[PDB]
Amino acid sequence: RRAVTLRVLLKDELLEPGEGVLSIYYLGRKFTGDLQLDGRIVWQETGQVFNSPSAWATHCKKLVNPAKKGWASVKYKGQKLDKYKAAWLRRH
């Protein structure tokens, strides 16, 4: 499951790269991300580059709730990334 990265999903065209195609909603705050062809995420607000959905999600949620502490929270065009991981496995 961990093996199935954004890089892998992009290569087999489960996902397309693009600006503002990734989103997180957490306790009232919306976060928007650009998906690069290399599978890295650009947080639009600061331009900070993250290596994984989990890395971006943990950073964004800690700003809202420092107690908190990826694939379930991060959405690609309104669908959870977990749905694309599962879809890759079912496609092989």
Residue numbers in the entry: 62 to 130, 134 to 156
Source paper text:
Recent research has identified the Mpr1/Pad1 N-terminal (MPN) domain-containing protein (MPND) as a sensor protein that may recognize DNA 6mA modification in eukaryotes. Moreover, the Mpr1/Pad1 N-terminal (MPN) domain-containing protein (MPND) was the first reported protein containing the RAMA domain to directly bind to DNA with the 6mA modification in vitro. In this work, we investigated the first crystal structures of the apo–MPND and the MPND–DNA complex from Mus musculus at the atomic resolution. Our results revealed that MPND possesses multiple functions, such as binding DNA and interacting with histones.
In the final structural model, the asymmetric unit contained two protein protomers, each with three helices (α1–α3), two long antiparallel β-strands (β1–β2), and four short β-strands (β3–β6). Each protomer included MPND residues 62–156 with missing residues (131–133). According to the SDS-PAGE of crystals, the key reason the N-terminal structure could not be resolved was due to the conformational flexibility during crystallization rather than due to protein degradation. The main structural differences between the two protein protomers were in the irregular loops, particularly in the N-terminal location. Interestingly, the structural analysis suggested two possible dimer configurations: dimer 1, which possessed an interface area of 439 Å2; and dimer 2, which was generated from the symmetry and possessed an interface area of 411 Å2. Therefore, the oligomeric state of apo–MPND in the solution is mainly monomeric.
